[PDB]
Enzyme design. Structure first.
Site, short mmCIF file in Angstrom:
data_model
loop_
_atom_site.label_atom_id
_atom_site.label_comp_id
_atom_site.label_asym_id
_atom_site.label_seq_id
_atom_site.Cartn_x
_atom_site.Cartn_y
_atom_site.Cartn_z
N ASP A 197 -14.79 6.79 -3.84
CA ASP A 197 -13.71 6.68 -4.85
C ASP A 197 -12.46 7.36 -4.26
N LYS A 254 6.53 -8.11 13.67
CA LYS A 254 5.52 -8.45 12.66
C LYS A 254 5.50 -9.96 12.48
N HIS A 291 17.13 1.54 -1.67
CA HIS A 291 16.68 0.81 -0.46
C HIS A 291 15.21 1.10 -0.26
N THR A 351 10.78 -5.68 12.25
CA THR A 351 10.35 -6.77 11.34
C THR A 351 10.04 -8.01 12.19
N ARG A 355 27.91 -12.55 -10.00
CA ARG A 355 26.63 -12.19 -10.63
C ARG A 355 26.90 -11.81 -12.09
N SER A 369 3.80 8.25 -12.80
CA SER A 369 2.71 7.32 -12.38
C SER A 369 2.71 7.15 -10.86
N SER A 370 3.81 6.66 -10.31
CA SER A 370 3.96 6.33 -8.88
C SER A 370 3.73 7.53 -7.94
N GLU A 420 12.96 1.74 -2.19
CA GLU A 420 12.23 1.01 -3.28
C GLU A 420 11.81 -0.40 -2.85
N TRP A 425 20.09 -3.21 -13.62
CA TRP A 425 18.90 -2.40 -13.25
C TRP A 425 19.35 -1.17 -12.45
N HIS A 478 24.76 0.37 2.35
CA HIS A 478 25.01 -1.09 2.49
C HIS A 478 25.10 -1.76 1.10
N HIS A 479 24.84 -1.02 0.01
CA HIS A 479 24.89 -1.53 -1.38
C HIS A 479 26.21 -1.15 -2.03
N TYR A 512 11.36 -1.76 0.52
CA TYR A 512 10.34 -1.72 1.60
C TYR A 512 9.00 -1.25 1.00
N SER A 526 -1.37 -9.63 6.90
CA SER A 526 -2.04 -9.32 8.19
C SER A 526 -3.53 -9.59 8.06
C1 HEA Z 1 11.31 -7.11 -0.93
C2 HEA Z 1 12.60 -7.00 -1.20
C3 HEA Z 1 13.63 -7.01 -0.17
C4 HEA Z 1 13.49 -7.10 1.27
C5 HEA Z 1 12.26 -7.20 2.06
C6 HEA Z 1 14.92 -7.04 1.71
C7 HEA Z 1 15.25 -7.08 3.13
C8 HEA Z 1 16.59 -6.85 3.72
N1 HEA Z 1 17.72 -6.70 3.00
FE1 HEA Z 1 17.93 -6.77 0.90
N2 HEA Z 1 17.97 -6.60 -1.16
C9 HEA Z 1 16.98 -6.61 -2.12
C10 HEA Z 1 15.59 -6.78 -1.77
C11 HEA Z 1 15.08 -6.93 -0.40
N3 HEA Z 1 15.84 -6.93 0.73
C12 HEA Z 1 17.40 -6.48 -3.54
C13 HEA Z 1 16.72 -6.43 -4.87
C14 HEA Z 1 18.86 -6.33 -3.34
C15 HEA Z 1 19.91 -6.23 -4.38
C16 HEA Z 1 19.86 -5.07 -5.32
C17 HEA Z 1 20.89 -5.52 -6.31
O1 HEA Z 1 22.05 -5.47 -5.89
O2 HEA Z 1 20.56 -5.99 -7.53
C18 HEA Z 1 19.07 -6.45 -1.87
C19 HEA Z 1 20.43 -6.37 -1.27
C20 HEA Z 1 20.85 -6.24 0.12
C21 HEA Z 1 22.25 -5.92 0.50
C22 HEA Z 1 23.43 -5.70 -0.43
C23 HEA Z 1 24.18 -7.00 -0.68
C24 HEA Z 1 25.26 -6.84 -1.68
O3 HEA Z 1 24.98 -6.07 -2.75
O4 HEA Z 1 26.37 -7.42 -1.53
C25 HEA Z 1 22.12 -5.90 1.96
C26 HEA Z 1 23.14 -5.53 2.93
O5 HEA Z 1 22.79 -5.18 4.04
C27 HEA Z 1 20.69 -6.18 2.25
C28 HEA Z 1 20.10 -6.22 3.60
C29 HEA Z 1 18.67 -6.46 3.95
C30 HEA Z 1 18.17 -6.47 5.34
C31 HEA Z 1 18.85 -6.26 6.66
C32 HEA Z 1 16.75 -6.75 5.18
C33 HEA Z 1 15.73 -6.82 6.26
O6 HEA Z 1 14.58 -6.01 5.86
C34 HEA Z 1 15.34 -8.25 6.67
C35 HEA Z 1 14.83 -8.20 8.10
C36 HEA Z 1 14.01 -9.43 8.41
C37 HEA Z 1 14.47 -10.48 9.13
C38 HEA Z 1 15.87 -10.59 9.69
C39 HEA Z 1 13.52 -11.61 9.33
C40 HEA Z 1 12.48 -11.21 10.36
C41 HEA Z 1 13.10 -10.89 11.70
C42 HEA Z 1 13.13 -11.69 12.81
C43 HEA Z 1 12.51 -13.03 12.83
C44 HEA Z 1 13.79 -11.13 14.07
C45 HEA Z 1 14.91 -11.97 14.68
C46 HEA Z 1 16.17 -11.61 13.92
C47 HEA Z 1 17.41 -11.45 14.45
C48 HEA Z 1 17.66 -11.63 15.92
C49 HEA Z 1 18.58 -11.07 13.55
N4 HEA Z 1 19.98 -6.40 1.10
C1 HEA Z 2 10.10 -8.69 -8.42
C2 HEA Z 2 11.33 -8.93 -8.75
C3 HEA Z 2 11.73 -10.27 -9.22
C4 HEA Z 2 11.01 -11.54 -9.40
C5 HEA Z 2 9.59 -11.94 -9.13
C6 HEA Z 2 12.07 -12.40 -9.99
C7 HEA Z 2 11.77 -13.81 -10.28
C8 HEA Z 2 12.77 -14.75 -10.78
N1 HEA Z 2 14.08 -14.41 -11.08
FE1 HEA Z 2 15.08 -12.57 -10.86
N2 HEA Z 2 16.08 -10.82 -10.43
C9 HEA Z 2 15.55 -9.68 -9.98
C10 HEA Z 2 14.14 -9.48 -9.66
C11 HEA Z 2 13.12 -10.53 -9.69
N3 HEA Z 2 13.30 -11.80 -10.12
C12 HEA Z 2 16.45 -8.57 -9.80
C13 HEA Z 2 16.13 -7.21 -9.30
C14 HEA Z 2 17.72 -9.14 -10.18
C15 HEA Z 2 19.07 -8.45 -10.21
C16 HEA Z 2 19.08 -7.83 -11.61
C17 HEA Z 2 20.48 -7.35 -11.99
O1 HEA Z 2 21.41 -8.08 -11.78
O2 HEA Z 2 20.66 -6.14 -12.54
C18 HEA Z 2 17.36 -10.52 -10.55
C19 HEA Z 2 18.38 -11.48 -11.03
C20 HEA Z 2 18.09 -12.89 -11.37
C21 HEA Z 2 19.20 -13.76 -11.69
C22 HEA Z 2 20.65 -13.41 -11.78
C23 HEA Z 2 20.99 -12.74 -13.11
C24 HEA Z 2 22.49 -12.84 -13.13
O3 HEA Z 2 23.18 -12.42 -12.19
O4 HEA Z 2 23.00 -13.48 -14.16
C25 HEA Z 2 18.50 -15.00 -11.97
C26 HEA Z 2 19.14 -16.26 -12.34
O5 HEA Z 2 18.51 -17.28 -12.34
C27 HEA Z 2 17.08 -14.75 -11.70
C28 HEA Z 2 16.01 -15.78 -11.85
C29 HEA Z 2 14.58 -15.58 -11.50
C30 HEA Z 2 13.60 -16.73 -11.50
C31 HEA Z 2 13.72 -18.19 -11.87
C32 HEA Z 2 12.37 -16.15 -11.04
C33 HEA Z 2 11.15 -16.95 -10.86
O6 HEA Z 2 11.17 -17.22 -9.43
C34 HEA Z 2 9.85 -16.32 -11.31
C35 HEA Z 2 8.79 -17.37 -11.53
C36 HEA Z 2 7.57 -16.66 -12.15
C37 HEA Z 2 6.72 -15.88 -11.44
C38 HEA Z 2 6.84 -15.66 -9.97
C39 HEA Z 2 5.58 -15.23 -12.20
C40 HEA Z 2 4.65 -14.40 -11.33
C41 HEA Z 2 3.62 -13.73 -12.20
C42 HEA Z 2 2.51 -13.24 -11.65
C43 HEA Z 2 2.33 -13.37 -10.15
C44 HEA Z 2 1.47 -12.50 -12.47
C45 HEA Z 2 0.04 -12.97 -12.17
C46 HEA Z 2 -0.78 -11.95 -11.43
C47 HEA Z 2 -2.07 -11.67 -11.73
C48 HEA Z 2 -2.91 -12.27 -12.83
C49 HEA Z 2 -2.77 -10.66 -10.93
N4 HEA Z 2 16.87 -13.48 -11.34
CU LIG Z 3 19.17 -2.22 0.40
O LIG Z 4 17.60 -4.91 0.59
#
Ligand code: HEA
Ligand code: HEA
Ligand SMILES: [Cu+2]
Ligand SMILES: [O-]
Ligand SMILES: CCCCCCCCCCCCCCCCCC(=O)OCC(COC(=O)CCCCCCCCCCCCCCCCC)OC(=O)CCCCCCCCCCCCCCCCC
Ligand SMILES: CCCCCCCCCCCCCCCCCC(=O)OCC(COC(=O)CCCCCCCCCCCCCCCCC)OC(=O)CCCCCCCCCCCCCCCCC
Ligand SMILES: CCCCCCCCCCCCCCCCCC(=O)OCC(COC(=O)CCCCCCCCCCCCCCCCC)OC(=O)CCCCCCCCCCCCCCCCC
Ligand SMILES: CCCCC/C=C/C/C=C/CCCCCCCC(=O)O[C@H](COC(=O)CCCCCCCCCCCCCCC)COP(=O)(O)OCC[N+](C)(C)C
Ligand SMILES: CCCCCC/C=C\CCCCCCCCCC(=O)O[C@H](COC(=O)CCCCCCCCCCCCCCC)COP(=O)(O)OC[C@@H](O)CO
Ligand SMILES: CCCCCC/C=C\CCCCCCCCCC(=O)O[C@H](COC(=O)CCCCCCCCCCCCCCC)COP(=O)(O)OC[C@@H](O)CO
Ligand SMILES: CCCCCC/C=C\CCCCCCCCCC(=O)O[C@H](COC(=O)CCCCCCCCCCCCCCC)COP(=O)(O)OC[C@@H](O)CO
Ligand SMILES: CCCCCCCCCCO[C@H]1O[C@H](CO)[C@@H](O[C@H]2O[C@H](CO)[C@@H](O)[C@H](O)[C@@H]2O)[C@H](O)[C@H]1O
Ligand SMILES: C[C@H](CCC(=O)O)[C@H]1CC[C@H]2[C@@H]3[C@H](O)C[C@@H]4C[C@H](O)CC[C@]4(C)[C@H]3C[C@H](O)[C@]12C
Ligand SMILES: C[C@H](CCC(=O)O)[C@H]1CC[C@H]2[C@@H]3[C@H](O)C[C@@H]4C[C@H](O)CC[C@]4(C)[C@H]3C[C@H](O)[C@]12C
Ligand SMILES: CC(=O)N[C@@H](CO)C(=O)O
Ligand code: CUA
Ligand SMILES: [Mg+2]
Ligand code: NA
Ligand SMILES: [Zn+2]
Lengths: 49, 84, 105, 43, 49, 227, 514, 72, 46, 144
Positions: free
Chosen positions: G91, G319, G240, G316, G438, G156-157, G242, G126, G290-291, G244, G255
């Site tokens: 456990d 991977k 940020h 990245t 937005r 919780s987390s 949050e 949010w 960057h935000h 990754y 994997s």
């Molecule tokens: C799981 C969620 C998730 C993940 C994985 C990422 C991944 C990344 N994000 Fe994003 N991001 C969000 C969730 C995520 N983000 C959310 C929610 C916001 C908005 C919050 C909000 O404003 O509401 C946001 C917003 C956001 C901004 C702000 C934009 C704006 O507000 O105007 C920026 C700017 O740098 C950014 C950058 C990146 C980068 C560099 C990666 C990298 O991790 C991606 C790297 C991966 C690749 C590039 C692909 C794999 C790589 C290769 C195949 C290698 C070859 C590549 C090169 C040679 C370039 N993200």
């Molecule tokens: C995890 C995060 C997440 C996910 C999954 C989604 C899913 C979707 N989102 Fe959302 N979205 C956000 C996080 C997410 N979003 C965030 C952070 C913002 C910015 C908020 C802000 O502006 O403040 C945003 C903003 C956002 C906007 C812009 C709001 C605006 O600027 O006016 C819109 C517009 O269409 C949108 C649409 C959708 C749609 C169609 C889906 C669909 O793709 C979803 C379809 C349904 C599913 C994928 C269901 C999955 C359910 C399960 C998998 C449960 C089952 C599991 C078990 C039984 C074990 N999203």
């Molecule tokens: Cu970020």
């Molecule tokens: O991001």
């Protein structure tokens, strides 16, 4: 050494290897790891008094 | 600016090598590249005979006694102005 | 870390073990299909003969099925292997998948 | 993954129900809020 | 026997793709959804003064 | 402004914004690549029967997998950083307009010479004159002289706003108690539209911007006609 | 017994189940909130009313999918199920504490649902930015109830992270080094350090906002010397890290799946995948500004954050290129769960680049607070983090239950979801290029076609979500019992039978030192 | 008549070494296509537009058209 | 000791599939119903 | 044949091209006749029938390689059922338009678009590539 008729063995076939080979081990003849063919034998005892 | 790896709970020599090659030297190379991209003959300063600089209260024990040890004629004036 | 002549040799030696057992027979076939190569007929020979020692006709067919599979789209490999083996095959009355009808869907 | 056969096989007909019931459990109430939308605003 | 995909594969494939094409065309072309396509070579500019 | 079915960026009315388009054009060349190489190699691995399930060796391939993308990334940064420092630059501005963001309109101050100030609301759909662009049109426009370097200071007297004119490549946040400086250069005259780019409450949607660029001499009169 | 089994539990498995259920329910609410959003945008004009009621819905959609769906399933469900079975632990270090981490989550949600029913709800986004989130624009209990949601949800987390790290570090077989634990195990350990270090600073920031609304502090009030921007930093210092958090375990599962369904005995480049996430973790902490590229900060800073944000692409990459090598000469078995993993690999890599765009302070000038941003993070979250979730869920459903799903049906599910999220989000790339902001209930005439299309996609994604509720039923309805599983020699979780017993590893595994 | 011995080793190795080039090619030829089809057009289209641009002849036709508030 | 094995390790019952459909109907449906009835109540005040 | 749950801990049988010789036979238990074929397998293999050879193969192994590797028509059901559910999905959309969605704004009527379009060409919206550049100002018509 086991308190039952089976116990799960893990086999690190070579040092630093990233992957443990797992399998059930039973009372009986010795058993060999399905990777490196290393031999393992179950040795029942207890912990009453 | 934090750190986040999470204990590499195995054997020491190996983890410190992971860290040597995965972190230590990678960042010495990122850093080298960041100076191999900033390096250059950035343009040399105008001369002013500010008294609180190029202090000679006593000759130096070498050269004509008026030249610092790591002297560089391109960037390092004497009391009386640049060389050449 | 070895030449191809060493590899081919090393495996033939494994399969010409006379007190080879069926744990060792399965091991070596299941180890060998892993590699990026269809085995030399002289190994399929050595194995087909470790089956005879072990009185397992079945596995001797399965081995021939596996030759044809490791080949994939290179259609010409299996027919050449089945030439080189024809002797050992009719020596031991080993029938091929194609003959027993186990290439039919 | 090898499984047994089902112990309580869900015939097509039974599947057709579960699909019918499940689609309606989401679709129906959403509909009743979205249909009476106009009514909510006049207040 | 033959399986569900033998017995019904084509029926499902044929009758899906058809019911799909019909309702989407209809929903796109016959209920007055406004798509606002590029006016270029379509709309004739009119004076607004 | 943005037209029906638009795929990409508004047309560059200011040179900076031009610079972005071509830079953006660069970054997408590489995006279109890495996405195709990954989609291609994926399909390659899945379309053979030939196999190799025994342990495989990293070091030598994991080298290509790092040194290439590190070059691909300098290539993107090198111009990104040029265009970013280019946005700062020792420019010589001739006019200084301050904008304030309100729940939910924009006020303007031209206070170099005179004490000229005014509000700028949206034309309610019901009151647009046939031809007028829903959600975009303002009663009083930001008349600016075209083909000159202008200093815009942004702040808000309440919540956060963002002052945003896509076509010129401008967006700066309105932060209460904070005077944020951007610079404005139109290559052409005409009308140039924008919207609030931070969530400010009930009418965030409905508090737009419209620049009117015109000559200097059609400006100075407009200035004097507003006091 | 029932009250003792489910309410009072100290069983790592029974607790995982509670999370899978909570996170399934959350998803239902998350979906509805996302449909409402696209009801409002699917044609021009106004449907609900003004930006207010619209942004309470937008905001809520974000907290539920993030805090009550993706983290609860991915960490608490699959964590609590798989982690102890992958390292032969009986456990969790702290099983009583494990259960409080669960039961703190209904409360947390209910304060969230309370917020949206008190006054006019908290439409703040949010990010909850002052001064909108402050006591003059958002006067009422709404924003206080939202701050309290997050407090409980962060406890919780942080308690759950202390549990995993202490479990993964302390409770392996003695012979087992960290370097012989599965990739998932590694993903969760790293994801718990990110939580452990970022959530405290999140809490600190939302605490100063409570004491600005309630106790007459001025942390974010220029009237008393404060700075609204201070808040943006503390929040994004968390925010940020949050994200990754939200993908790292997806890496983990992916994997696993790609390895098991390629018939390989380990994934390509084990230590490569270890270095990769320990990097993505580390650099995920030094990028938060960057935000904030349009807040008005020094050019020298903006160019650091640009450059630092882009370094993340190398590890990245490693991977992406590893998974692809784990397929190379695999015996590909074309399961639903392989389909989920494959999709991940390509739609994660799309979203991943669209954020390298965003890395450039230059462009983000124009792309900030447009849909282009929404498009980036719906490809990595909707088409990555959820693909991992459905992938895992599909692959491991028989371990938790002991029953098989119908694989045909489960590809029919994958099929419709693929068409739905891509039609939902691929047009949002175009909207933000054309400069649609937005957080708008309504848009200029120009932007209509893509907004119609985007919302059609969101009605296909609904068919998917409804189908998956009927596919879970069928399986339980039918009760086909798993018999035999492949590849057990390298996948210890499957060794104790589907489902495994209440008490596993009662007698620990033998692993010897050579 | 005997069949001759074919290539029996590193069959999957051969398949990759061939196609890794094919993917370089596809991509790198999608590289060229984008330069021609899009980028080098943008640069040609801005340069062509601005070359013989009189901003007063723009302002003038715009003024006659009745669009401006500052310029009747 | 608590029940071991398939259909035993959950806090609901799968002993009869038509009670189970009713259960999943409420569980999932309630959660999807919720946002709608919440948007209603916000419009129904002022 | 028949497999029990209870023996997850015992070596099980499986058809798999990367594991062509599994840990146990498919048929553990032999009839009288099957015992006497296993007896014949200790002699020369030339003294077996084809019938007698197939049978030995089917004791040690369940499906043949060609059987274990045969393609199906899953995809037909997987593609056509998807296309039915994507179809269904429009019935919701048509319902939404007919009962939920109000009348759209007047700035969308034929008239306004025509006036608003010229008004846009009159201010030279996107004149380098996107809009006004797709208009001939001399001939006074969209470009061919
Ligand atoms: C799981 C969620 C998730 C993940 C994985 C990422 C991944 C990344 N994000 Fe994003 N991001 C969000 C969730 C995520 N983000 C959310 C929610 C916001 C908005 C919050 C909000 O404003 O509401 C946001 C917003 C956001 C901004 C702000 C934009 C704006 O507000 O105007 C920026 C700017 O740098 C950014 C950058 C990146 C980068 C560099 C990666 C990298 O991790 C991606 C790297 C991966 C690749 C590039 C692909 C794999 C790589 C290769 C195949 C290698 C070859 C590549 C090169 C040679 C370039 N993200
Ligand atoms: C995890 C995060 C997440 C996910 C999954 C989604 C899913 C979707 N989102 Fe959302 N979205 C956000 C996080 C997410 N979003 C965030 C952070 C913002 C910015 C908020 C802000 O502006 O403040 C945003 C903003 C956002 C906007 C812009 C709001 C605006 O600027 O006016 C819109 C517009 O269409 C949108 C649409 C959708 C749609 C169609 C889906 C669909 O793709 C979803 C379809 C349904 C599913 C994928 C269901 C999955 C359910 C399960 C998998 C449960 C089952 C599991 C078990 C039984 C074990 N999203
Ligand atoms: Cu970020
Ligand atoms: O991001
Ligand atoms: C169903 C969803 C909807 C899909 C949308 C389709 C659109 C159909 C409409 C009519 C369509 C006409 C043009 C077709 C190209 C459409 C997209 C494109 O390339 O547009 C280019 C640019 C914008 O560039 C422009 O500036 C447009 C200039 C166009 C000039 C070409 C000549 C004229 C023809 C085009 C007309 C406009 C010209 C006027 C404009 C002049 C300048 C603006 O868009 C972008 O930046 C989009 C950013 C997305 C990046 C994601 C990465 C790729 C993912 C998948 C890769 C592998 C494939 C598998 C793929 C699998 C996964 C998807
Ligand atoms: C003698 C009296 C005892 C008194 C004690 C109380 C009464 C006990 C009964 C009497 C004792 C006798 C034993 C009962 C036998 C089972 C009968 C049954 O079916 O009885 C039904 C019971 C139990 O109900 C449940 O368990 C809830 C689930 C509902 C069924 C849907 C199935 C889900 C399918 C999807 C699964 C896929 C994913 C997982 C797949 C993985 C598989 C492992 O009803 C209730 O009385 C509710 C009690 C609460 C139990 C904990 C539920 C967990 C809450 C999760 C968060 C909710 C979200 C809101 C959050 C908050 C927002 C507001
Ligand atoms: C193919 C690459 C995919 C790339 C896409 C990546 C990105 C997107 C993710 C997208 C990833 C999904 C890729 C689907 C292709 C799978 C077809 C297949 O090999 O079928 C699997 C086989 C398995 O065969 C066996 O039982 C064992 C034999 C061993 C494996 C066979 C294949 C191995 C390769 C050999 C090929 C032959 C040589 C050809 C030589 C080379 C030919 C040039 O089963 C059968 O016979 C048929 C059963 C298939 C049922 C699933 C259908 C998939 C529907 C998905 C729709 C989504 C889009 C919406 C669509 C519907 C809405 C309209
Ligand atoms: C950004 C995109 C760039 C793409 C990168 C491209 C890489 C170029 C590499 C090309 C070579 C192809 C190698 C892979 C096929 C398997 C090779 C194999 O099967 O080789 C065996 C590997 O096993 C051993 O030793 C164990 C050590 C394993 C060494 C072989 C595997 C290395 C490559 C695997 C990575 C695949 C990634 C592709 C998809 C990204 C070695 O056997 P032998 O020594 O008896 O061979 C002798 C054959 N001779 C005589 C013809 C040379
Ligand atoms: C990358 C990490 C390096 C951190 C070390 C750097 C610290 C201090 C350096 C500053 C020294 C200069 C002092 C005089 C100048 C004022 C400080 C300053 O420069 O920073 C100011 C305050 O921020 C601040 O220090 C913010 C307060 C410091 C927060 C540091 C961020 C990391 C915190 C997490 C660390 C956790 C570790 C555990 C603790 C031991 C903000 O910028 P201004 O100056 O208002 O810009 C005004 C504009 O007009 C620009 O022209
Ligand atoms: C266009 C809209 C209509 C819907 C389209 C159809 C949708 C999906 C139906 C899929 C049909 C089954 C798929 C074929 C194989 C997998 C499941 C199956 O058919 O069920 C098999 C039952 O066997 C048997 O025929 C025993 C007898 C039971 C048969 C089970 C299926 C019968 C009913 C299927 C049709 C449902 C109709 C739905 C209408 C809403 C068991 O599974 P196996 O094949 O033994 O292997 C699975 C392994 O995990 C076990 O080792
Ligand atoms: C304004 C209101 C907001 C809401 C705040 C209130 C929230 C929660 C209040 C409830 C907390 C009090 C209840 C006691 C909890 C004690 C847990 C504990 O102390 O757990 C111990 C392990 O934690 C350890 O040491 C290491 C961990 C010790 C942590 C102690 C509990 C922390 C509670 C506060 C968390 C605040 C977060 C701080 C960072 C922001 C023991 O593990 P158990 O599994 O118990 O047993 C295992 C057996 O082997 C023991 O014999
Ligand atoms: C976005 C999520 C959901 C989108 C897809 C939803 C499609 C809706 C399914 C049907 O649901 C509705 O059906 C009727 C409308 O067709 C409504 O009847 C209403 O209308 C009838 C006649 O118009 C009355 O007689 C009824 O009592 C009632 O008022 C009914 O109450 C409502 O549940
Ligand atoms: C030493 C360490 C761990 C391997 C082991 O000890 O088992 C290995 C595994 C991951 C490796 C790194 C990654 O493979 C990525 C890079 C690969 C390049 O070829 C060298 C540097 C590079 C940065 C590697 C340095 C070093 O070789 C690492 C860090
Ligand atoms: C943004 C933050 C200030 C937070 C605040 O004002 O509350 C400051 C603190 C330390 C700063 C960093 C350090 O001063 C070191 C670097 C100095 C360079 O000129 C810019 C990048 C550089 C990496 C800085 C970027 C940024 O301005 C940081 C990170
Ligand atoms: C030329 C010839 O007769 N070839 C043979 C092959 O052995 C046939 O049969
Ligand atoms: Cu003001 Cu948004
Ligand atoms: Mg902003
Ligand atoms: Na709307
Ligand atoms: Zn071993």
């Amino acid at each position: 050494p086991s308190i039952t008729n089976k116990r799960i063995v893990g086999c690190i076939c070579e040092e630093d290897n990233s992957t443990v080979i797992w399998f059930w081990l039973h009372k009986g003849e010795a058993q060999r790891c399905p990777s490196c063919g290393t031999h393992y034998k179950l040795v029942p005892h207890q912990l009453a008094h | 600016a934090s750190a986040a790896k999470g204990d590499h709970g195995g054997t020491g020599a190996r983890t410190w090598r992971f860290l040597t090659f995965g972190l230590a030297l990678p960042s010495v190379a990122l850093c080298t590249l960041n100076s191999w991209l900033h390096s250059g003959h950035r343009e040399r300063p105008a001369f002013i005979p500010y008294h609180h600089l190029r202090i000679r209260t006593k000759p130096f024990s070498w050269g004509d006694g008026n030249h610092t040890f790591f002297h560089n004629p391109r960037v390092n004036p004497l009391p009386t102005g640049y060389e050449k | 870390h070895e030449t191809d002549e060493e590899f081919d040799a090393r495996w033939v030696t494994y399969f010409n073990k006379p007190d080879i057992d069926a744990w060792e027979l399965r091991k070596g076939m299941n180890t060998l299909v892993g590699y990026d190569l269809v085995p030399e007929p002289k190994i399929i020979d050595a194995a087909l003969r470790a089956c005879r020692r072990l009185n397992d006709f079945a596995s001797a067919v399965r081995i021939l099925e596996v030759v044809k599979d490791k080949a994939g789209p290179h259609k010409e490999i299996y027919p050449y292997v089945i030439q080189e083996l024809r002797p050992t095959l009719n020596e031991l009355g080993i029938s091929t998948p194609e003959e027993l009808g186990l290439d039919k869907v | 993954i090898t499984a047994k056969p089902a112990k309580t096989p869900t015939s097509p007909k039974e599947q057709a129900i579960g699909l019918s019931v499940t689609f309606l459990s989401f679709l129906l109430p959403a509909g009743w809020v979205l249909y009476h939308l106009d009514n909510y605003k006049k207040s | 026997a033959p399986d569900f995909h033998d017995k019904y594969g084509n029926a499902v494939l044929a009758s899906g793709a058809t019911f799909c094409v019909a309702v989407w065309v209809y929903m796109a072309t016959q209920i007055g959804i406004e798509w606002n396509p590029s006016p270029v070579g379509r709309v004739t500019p009119k004076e607004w003064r | 402004m943005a037209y029906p079915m638009q795929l990409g960026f508004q047309d560059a009315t200011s040179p900076i914004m031009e610079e972005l388009l071509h830079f953006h054009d660069h970054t997408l060349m590489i995006v279109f690549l890495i996405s195709s190489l990954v989609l291609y190699i994926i399909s390659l691995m899945l379309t053979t029967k030939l196999t190799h399930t025994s342990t495989m060796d990293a070091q030598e391939v994991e080298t290509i997998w790092t040194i290439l993308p590190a070059i691909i990334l300098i290539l993107i940064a090198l111009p990104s950083l040029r265009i970013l420092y280019m946005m700062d630059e020792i420019n010589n501005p001739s006019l200084t307009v301050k904008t304030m963001g309100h729940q939910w309109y924009w006020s303007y101050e031209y206070t170099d010479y005179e004490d000229l100030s005014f509000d700028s609301y949206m034309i309610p759909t019901s009151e647009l004159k046939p031809g007028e662009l829903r959600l975009l049109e303002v009663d009083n426009r930001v008349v600016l002289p075209m083909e000159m370097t202008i200093r815009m200071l942004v702040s808000s007297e309440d919540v956060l706003h963002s002052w945003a004119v896509p076509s010129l490549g401008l967006k700066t946040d309105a932060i209460p108690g904070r005077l944020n400086q951007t610079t404005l250069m139109s290559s052409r005259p005409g009308l140039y539209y924008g919207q609030c780019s931070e969530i400010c409450g009930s009418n965030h949607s409905f508090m737009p911007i419209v620049l009117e660029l015109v000559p200097l001499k059609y400006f100075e009169k407009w200035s004097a006609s507003m006091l | 017994m029932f009250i003792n089994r489910w309410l009072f539990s100290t069983n790592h498995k029974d607790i995982g189940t509670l999370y899978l259920l909570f996170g399934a329910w959350a998803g239902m609410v998350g979906t509805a909130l996302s449909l409402l959003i696209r009801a409002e945008l699917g044609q021009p004009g106004t449907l609900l009313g003004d930006d207010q009621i619209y942004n309470v819905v937008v905001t809520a959609h974000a907290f539920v999918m993030i805090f009550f769906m993706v983290m609860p399933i991915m960490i608490g469900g699959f964590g609590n199920w798989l982690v102890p079975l992958m390292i032969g632990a009986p456990d969790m270090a702290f099983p009583r504490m494990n259960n409080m981490s669960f039961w703190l989550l209904p409360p947390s949600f209910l304060l969230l649902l309370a917020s949206s029913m008190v006054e006019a709800g908290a439409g703040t986004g949010w990010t909850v930015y002052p001064p909108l989130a402050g006591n003059l624009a958002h006067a009422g209990a709404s924003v206080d109830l939202t701050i309290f949601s997050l407090h409980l949800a962060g406890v919780s987390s942080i308690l759950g992270a202390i549990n995993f790290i202490t479990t993964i570090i302390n409770m392996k077989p003695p012979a087992m080094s960290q370097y012989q634990t599965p990739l998932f195990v590694w993903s969760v350990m790293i994801t718990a350090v990110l939580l452990l270090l970022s959530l405290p600073v999140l809490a600190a920031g939302i605490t100063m906002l409570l004491t600005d609304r309630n106790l007459n502090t001025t942390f974010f009030d220029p009237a008393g010397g404060g700075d609204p921007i201070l808040y943006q930093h503390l929040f994004w210092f968390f925010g940020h890290p949050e994200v990754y958090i939200l993908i790292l375990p997806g890496f983990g599962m992916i994997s696993h799946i790609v390895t098991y369904y390629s018939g390989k005995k380990e994934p390509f480049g084990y230590m490569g995948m270890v270095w990769a996430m320990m990097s993505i973790g580390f650099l995920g902490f030094i990028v938060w500004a960057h935000h904030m590229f349009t807040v008005g900060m020094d050019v020298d800073t903006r160019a650091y954050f640009t450059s630092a944000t882009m370094i993340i692409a190398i590890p990245t990459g490693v991977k992406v290129f590893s998974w692809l090598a784990t397929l190379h000469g695999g015996n590909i078995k074309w399961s639903p769960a392989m389909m989920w993993a494959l999709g991940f690999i390509f739609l994660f890599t799309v979203g991943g680049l669209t954020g390298i765009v965003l890395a450039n302070s230059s462009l983000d000038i124009v792309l900030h607070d447009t849909y282009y941003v929404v498009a980036h993070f719906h490809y990595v979250l909707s088409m990555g983090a959820v693909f991992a979730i459905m992938g895992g869920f599909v692959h491991w459903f028989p371990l938790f239950s002991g029953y098989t799903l119908n694989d045909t049906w489960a590809k029919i599910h994958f099929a419709i979801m693929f068409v739905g999220v891509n039609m939902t989000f691929f047009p949002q790339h175009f909207l933000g290029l054309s400069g649609m902001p937005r957080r708008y209930s309504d848009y200029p005439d120009a932007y209509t076609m893509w907004n119609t299309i985007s919302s059609m996609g969101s009605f296909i994604s609904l068919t998917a979500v409804m189908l998956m509720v009927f596919i879970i039923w069928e399986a339980f309805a039918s009760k086909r019992e798993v018999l035999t599983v492949d590849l057990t020699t390298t996948n210890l979780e499957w060794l104790n039978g589907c489902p495994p017993p209440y008490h596993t590893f009662e007698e620990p595994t033998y692993v010897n030192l050579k | 008549t005997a069949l001759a011995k074919p290539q029996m080793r590193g069959l999957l190795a051969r398949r990759l070494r061939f196609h890794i080039v094919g993917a370089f090619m596809v991509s790198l030829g999608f590289a060229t296509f984008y330069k021609f089809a899009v980028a080098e057009k943008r640069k040609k289209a801005y340069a062509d537009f601005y070359r013989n641009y009189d901003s007063m002849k723009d302002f003038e036709e715009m003024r006659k058209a009745g669009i401006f508030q500052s310029a009747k | 000791h608590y029940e071991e094995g398939p259909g035993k390790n959950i806090p609901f019952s799968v002993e009869n599939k038509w009670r189970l459909l009713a259960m999943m109907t409420l569980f999932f449906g309630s959660g999807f119903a919720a946002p709608f009835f919440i948007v209603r109540h916000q419009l129904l005040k002022k | 044949s028949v497999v029990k749950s209870e023996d997850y801990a015992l070596p099980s049988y499986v058809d798999r091209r990367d594991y062509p010789l599994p840990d146990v036979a498919h048929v553990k238990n032999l009839s009288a006749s099957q015992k006497a074929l296993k007896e014949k397998e200790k002699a020369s293999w030339s003294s077996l029938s084809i019938d007698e050879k197939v049978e030995l193969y089917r004791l040690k192994f369940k499906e043949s390689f060609a059987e274990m590797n045969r393609s199906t028509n899953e995809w037909k059901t997987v593609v056509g059922a998807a296309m039915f559910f994507i179809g269904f999905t429009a019935l919701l959309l048509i319902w939404e338009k007919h009962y939920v969605y109000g009348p759209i704004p007047h700035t969308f009527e034929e008239e306004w678009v025509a006036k608003q379009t010229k008004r846009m060409l009159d201010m030279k919206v996107a004149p380098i590539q996107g809009f006004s550049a797709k208009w001939d100002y001399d001939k006074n018509e969209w470009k061919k």
